[PDB]
Amino acid sequence: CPLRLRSGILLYGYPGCGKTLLASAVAQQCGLNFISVKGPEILNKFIGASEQNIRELFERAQSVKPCILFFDEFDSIAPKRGHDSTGVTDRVVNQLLTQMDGAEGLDGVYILAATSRPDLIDSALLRPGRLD
Amino acid sequence: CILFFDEFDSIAPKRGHDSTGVTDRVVNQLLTQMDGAEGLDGVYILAATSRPDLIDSALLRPGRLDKSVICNIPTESERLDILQAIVNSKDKDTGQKKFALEKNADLKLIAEKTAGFSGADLQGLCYNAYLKSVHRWLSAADQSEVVPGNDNIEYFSINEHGRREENRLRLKTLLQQDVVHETKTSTSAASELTAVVTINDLLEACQETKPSISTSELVKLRGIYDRFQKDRNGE
Amino acid sequence: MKASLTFSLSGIYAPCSISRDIYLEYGDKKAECLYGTIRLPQYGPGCTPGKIVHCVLDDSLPFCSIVVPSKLFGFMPTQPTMDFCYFEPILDNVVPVLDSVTFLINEQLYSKLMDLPQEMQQIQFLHYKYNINSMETVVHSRDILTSGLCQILNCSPFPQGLVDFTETQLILVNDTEQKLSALKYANEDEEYALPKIGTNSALSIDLESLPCTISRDLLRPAPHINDDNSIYAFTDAETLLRLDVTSGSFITVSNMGCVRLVKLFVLLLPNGFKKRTIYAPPKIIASFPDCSVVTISKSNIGHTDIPIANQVFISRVGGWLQSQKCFQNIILTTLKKFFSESKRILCQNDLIPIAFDSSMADLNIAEENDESDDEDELGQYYKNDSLVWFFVTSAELDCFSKDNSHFIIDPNRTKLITTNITNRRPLPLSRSNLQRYYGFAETFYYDLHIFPYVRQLVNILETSFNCSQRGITLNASVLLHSTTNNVGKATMVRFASKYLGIHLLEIDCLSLTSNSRQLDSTSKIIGYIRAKCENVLPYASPAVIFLAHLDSILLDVNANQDPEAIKLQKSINFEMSKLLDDFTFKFPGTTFVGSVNNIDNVPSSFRSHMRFEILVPVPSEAQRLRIFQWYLSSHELNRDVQQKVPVSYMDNISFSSLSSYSAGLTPLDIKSIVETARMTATARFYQESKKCGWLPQSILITQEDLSKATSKARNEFSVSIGAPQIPNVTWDDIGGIDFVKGEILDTIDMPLKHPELFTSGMKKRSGILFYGPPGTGKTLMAKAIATNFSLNFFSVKGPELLNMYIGESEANVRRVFQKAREAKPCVIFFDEIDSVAPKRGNQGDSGGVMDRIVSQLLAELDGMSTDADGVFVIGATNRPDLLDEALLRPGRFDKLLYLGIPDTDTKQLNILEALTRKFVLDNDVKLIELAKLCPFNYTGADFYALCSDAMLNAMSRIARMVEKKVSQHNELTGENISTRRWFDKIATKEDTKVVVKMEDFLKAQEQLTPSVSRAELNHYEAVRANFEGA
Amino acid sequence: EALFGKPQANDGDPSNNGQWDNASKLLNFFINQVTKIFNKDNKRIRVLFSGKQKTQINPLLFDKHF
Ligand SMILES: Nc1ncnc2c1ncn2[C@@H]1O[C@H](COP(=O)(O)OP(=O)(O)OP(=O)(O)O)[C@@H](O)[C@H]1O
C-alpha cells in the first residue's frame, strides 16, 4: 500500500479511567520505543527552546526504530490558539501540528496523547492523519 | 537628507510596552537627538505607521514635533485621479503606457464601483485586468499566428518511413546549425504587443476583488484616526 | 599499423587498394567485400578519428602501401602530402549499416533531381554519377561529392557506415543560403599561379607561433637524431619553393637588425594550417614579440660551419616561479638534462624555455643514474606543466670568428654558468598561446566583447602599463566581489594577466598563512608577503600582485569580541595598507588585484583607500553559451585522457537549448556538467563495445546525456540549499482542484512562460494565501505545486524561525530572503504563518517580537516586488482572521485562495478517483455510490481516512485468513510453522496482494465521523462571505 | 570528520572569526592541490572519504564540486 497508515490517535475519557496505564503498557505488548514525555518538560520558560524541545523529541523518535510518543495532560501542551497572550503556547502548537506535516520519516513513529478535556485542544490537530 | 522610519508602531511605541524596557531606553535615545538642539535640522525626519495610537504622545507634542499627515479613503475623485495616473503611466523601459490603455474609455464608471477601495486595491484591480487581457491575447493567438519566419525549406524525402514533422525539425536544426550567436534579433516593429483590457473585463475584475480591509476593521481604524486627529487639536 | 600511404586523384568513393602483403597477413579469403579503417598522423595532440573505407585486394602496390582517394579528406594531392598512415584491418567485417543519411544539393540541381515522376530513378542517378552500391559503398559525415554542389551533411546513427539502397533512409535538401557555393576542397580553387618563382632574395612574411608541438615522425627530411629538435620552424611548400631551398635547411629570421637562425620544413598534407605563413615554436617568437611580420632570408651556412662554444653565461629570467625556493632544484636539474640531451644552438641575447613537472619537484632524484638511459620514459611518466625562461647574458667561442652571434653547445666540451636574474616582459597571448603549445590546463579563453566587466579590468591594466611606459604613474587597485563563489574572479584575473603579457604575482592568503592566532601572526603574514613580493618583483616589472580571498585576513571585527584581538586586527589591516602603498611607490608600473566573496566584510577604511571595484556576475545566458562552446571544444576535452580513442559530441547539439536550462549556474557547474556527460558517454561506449563486439571508431556525446547532467546538477544545487520536502506528488494523486487550478497556473507559470509581457516595469504577482476548513489539504496542494513545477522550493516554517534571544530570528529572515533571491526562480512557503500574527496589546505578544518579525516579512515582501523576478510566496493557514491585516494588502497577497469543502458530488467524485489511483479495488466497488452517500462536510483528509479504514478492513480479512492458514496447517501437517515462516516463504504474492470490497468502504462510512463541527463550517463560511463577496 | 571537521553548528555568533577560514583551510588546500593534479592527469589520484554524516562533513567539498 502506498498510503500513510493511521498512526496518531487521541485518548480521552472519564478521569482516572486507566488511559495512563494502557498508554504505558502497549509499548511492551507491541514492542517499540516508548519515549514518554511530561507535558511541562516540553514547554520552557525561555523562547527558542520549546520548539527546540519538541524538535529534539521528534529527532529522537525518528532516530530510533518505529517509535511511540506519548503526551500526558495533552490539553495543557496544545491550548486553543490565539487566546494565549505570551504566544509561546500558540507557536508550540503550530510546531506540533507541523511535525506531522514532515515529508518522510513519519513512518513507524506513532503519536499518542491523553487528556480528559478534548475541548481545550484546538481541533486543527484532530485533522485525520495527525489524530484521526 | 530625508530619513524615514516605516512601521514606527513597531519602533518607538508608547512606553510601558516591554518587560526589559529596551523599547523605553531606545525611545529616550531617539528623543535625545530631535530634542537635542545641536543645529541638527538638515536631516528631514519622517516616519509612517498605520497604528499611530501605539506611539508615545511625547513623540507628537506640537512645537516639539511638527504636523502629522493622515491618509484618507480614495473616493470617486481620488480614485479617478489615481486610475488615470497609473493607467496612463509612461514606462521606464518602453515609455508608452504601462498597460495597453483604452484611448478614451469610460474611466469614470470604474471609480463608481470602487467605493471604499484603496489605491493599492485600484492598482491591483488594474493589474489583474491586465492579466485577463494577457490571457485573452494568448488565447487569440493560440491557433492564429503559430508559424515562424522564412518557412521556405525546400526538400523531398524517400524511405521517410513516417517521420515527417521530426524530419522537418532535424532539417531546421541542420540548416540553422551554424549562424546562431546570442539572439540575432532586432526590434521587429515593437508595436506594444499586449492586450487592452475590455471594459467588461475591468468590471468583472472589480467584482472579483475586495478591499484589503473588512467593515469592522475599517470602522474601528477610522474612528481611532479621527480620535487621534481630535487629540492633536487639543481634544 | 605503420604502413605507407599514397593518394589517388579518383572520386571520393573509389575503393582503397590494399597491397597483397597487407591483406594476406590476416585478411580472410572468401570474404565478399573487404573494409578497413585508417588513422592518420595529425599536427596536433588529438589523433583524429580513423575513416573506414571499402578496400580491394591488389599486388602492384609495394610492401605495406595503400592508395586512397584524396577526395575523402577534402583535398587533392597538389602539395607534398603525408607519406604514411596507420591502418587497421577489421576482423569479421561487421560493418554498420546506416539507418538514414542526409545529403546536400543546390536548388538548381535539386529541382532537376526531384522533378521526376518516380523515385527509384534518383537512386540510379547517384549510382551512375557517384558509383554507389547497396551494402557495398561506405559513407561518412561531412563527405563531399560535387565541389560546392553535392555533399553529405551527416548520417545520424554513426557519422560513418555502410549503405544499402533498399533499406537506407535518404534525406536531401536544397540550399537557399547557398552554403555549398562557398564550400570547395582544400587547395582546389588555388590554381598554379607561381608568384615570382624563385626570384626575390629575401621576403617579408607573417611569422606565427606553433599552435602545438610536433612529433619527430613528421619531419621530411628525416632529421639527424643528435640534431637540436628545438630549432625547427615549419611553413607551406610553395613558400619553400619561392625561396629555392629544401626542407630541413637553415634560414635566417630577423627584423631591425636582430637576427636568429632556424631550420625549415613543410606541412605534409592534409592540414588546416594557414597557408603562405611560417610557423615556429615560442622559442624564436620570444625574441620578436612586437614584430608581427618578420624578414625571411635564406642562410648560406651549413651545419659544419657552426663553431663550437667555449664559455656560456646565462641569467635566469625574472618570474614568479624563480622566487619559489621550493622549486629551484628541479629547474636547473631540468635545464641540465635538456642541454645534456643533445647539442643545442643559441646566440647572444636569447631566451630559453624549460618545462617541468611541478608536482614532481619535491623528489630530488639524484644523478647517480649515469646518463639515465630511459630519459624518454621518465619523461612520459612526467607530463610537463610549468614553464620558465632562461636568458643568455653572454658566451664565448673557442675559435676566433667574425660571427659574433651564432654558435653551438656541447654537453661536455662547453662550460656554462648561471648568474644574476634579468628582466623581460613576457609575450602576450596574441603572439602565442604558451599554455596550449606545451599542453597545460588551457586557461578559459575570453571574448571581452561578450564579457564587458573583463573589458573593464583589462582597460585598467593596459592603461596603467602605458602610463608607466609614458613616464606616468597612477597606482591602481581592483577588488572582485560576487554574491556566490566559483564565479571566475581568479580565472578572469589570470586570463587578463596572460592577455596583456604581464607577469603574474599571486598569493592565496587562504592557504599558506601557517599562523593566524599568535600575536606574531600579523608580523609573520605581513613579513612573508613583503618578502616574497620584494624578492621577485624588482626584476619582473611590469607585473600584478594578486591576493586570493584577501578578505580571509582583512575584516571588521565586531565590538562583540575581546579588545586586544581587535587591536591586533587593526594593526594587520594598517600594515597591509602600508605594504600596498610602499610597493606601488617603490615599484612604478606595478599594480595589484584582490578577490573577495563579500564586500561587507573588508575594512571600510581600507576599501575607501582603494581605486577600482568590480563584481563578477553569475554567467548570463550568452556567457553560458560561450562557456559551453569552449568546454565542448574537442582539443580541451581530450587533454586529460591518455586513452587512445578520442571523444567528441554530435553536431546536432543545440547549445542554445542547454544555455536555456543553465539558469543561475556557474562555471564550476558547467565543468561538472560537461565532464559528467563525458562520463555517461564513456560508460555507455565501453558497454557497447562489449555488446555489439565491433568497436565504434570514436566516443560520442548526445543531448540527453547533458539533459541528465543538468538535472543532476539541479538536484545537487537543491541538496546544497536543502529543499528536501519534495518526495513526490502529482495532480493525479488529488482531485477537486478545478477552479484553483486556473489561479495557481496563471499566477505561477504564466509569468515564467512569458515574462517579457510582464517585464514592463510592473508590479507582478505577489503571493497566494491558502485559507480553508481543516482537512481539505492545502498542504498536499502546496507539495503538489512544489514537485510538479520542478522549481527551487524552500519552506520556512514560522515557529522554527524564532530563537532564544530577540533579533537573530530576523537575521534568518533576511538571509533566507536573500538566499532565495539567489536561487531564482524560487518558491518560498510559510506554513501556519498565523503563529506570528498576534497584534499589539497587553493580551498579545507583549514584547513585540512578532511585530518585528512581520516587519521583516512585509519589508522584504515589498523589496522583492521590485526586482525579484522569480520569487513566489504561497501562504498556508487555517484561520486567516488572526493573521496580521498588514499582510492581506495586495503587493503582499492578492489571491486569498479559499480551499473550500467539496460541496458538489463532482468534487468528491474527483477526490475519490484520485485517492484510489493505486488501489486494488474489486469490480464490486461503486465510487459514485460513495459520492452519493457522503454529505457535503467531508474533506480530503476525511476521504483519505475512509479509504485507509477500508483498506485496513480488507487487510484484517487477509490477516485473519493467513492466521487460519497457519493454524489449520499446524494440525494437518502437524508443523507449527509460526506466521513468521509463512511471511518469509509461504505468504505468496496473492496473499500479499490486497483486495478490497465495497462493503469495507460502506462499513467505514457508517463508522465514519467527520472531523469538524457544522458550527466550524459555518464560521469558515462566514469568513468566506466577507472574503469573497466584495 | 576529525581532520577537516565541521565548525560545529550554532557557533554562537552569526558569522564568527573569518567564518572558521582557520580550520577548513586545510580542506581547501588539499582539494586545490588534488584538483591541480587531477585536471593534469585523471588515473593518478582518486580520493575516497568516509564520515559519519553528509551534513557533518564540511560542505566546501560540495561547494567546490569535489
Ligand atoms: N480494565 C482496566 N484496565 C486498566 N486500568 C483499569 C481498569 N479498570 C480500572 N483501572 C484503573 O484505572 C486507573 C486509572 O488510572 P490512570 O491514571 O491510567 O487514568 P486516566 O483516566 O488515564 O487519567 P489521567 O488522564 O488523569 O492520567 C488505573 O490506575 C487502573 O488501575
Ligand SMILES: Nc1ncnc2c1ncn2[C@@H]1O[C@H](COP(=O)(O)OP(=O)(O)OP(=O)(O)O)[C@@H](O)[C@H]1O
Ligand atoms: N568563463 C569562465 N569563467 C570562470 N571560470 C571558468 C570559466 N571557464 C571555465 N572556468 C573554470 O572555472 C573555475 C573557476 O575556479 P576559480 O578557483 O578561479 O574560482 P573563482 O570564481 O575565481 O573564485 P574562488 O577562489 O572563490 O573559487 C576554474 O576551474 C576555471 O577553469
Ligand SMILES: Nc1ncnc2c1ncn2[C@@H]1O[C@H](COP(=O)(O)OP(=O)(O)OP(=O)(O)O)[C@@H](O)[C@H]1O
Ligand atoms: N486531493 C487531495 N488534496 C489534498 N489532500 C488530500 C486529497 N485527497 C486526500 N487528501 C488527504 O487529506 C489530508 C490533508 O492533508 P494536508 O496536510 O495537505 O492538510 P491541510 O489542509 O494542508 O492541513 P494542515 O494545516 O493540517 O497541514 C491528507 O491526509 C491527504 O492525504
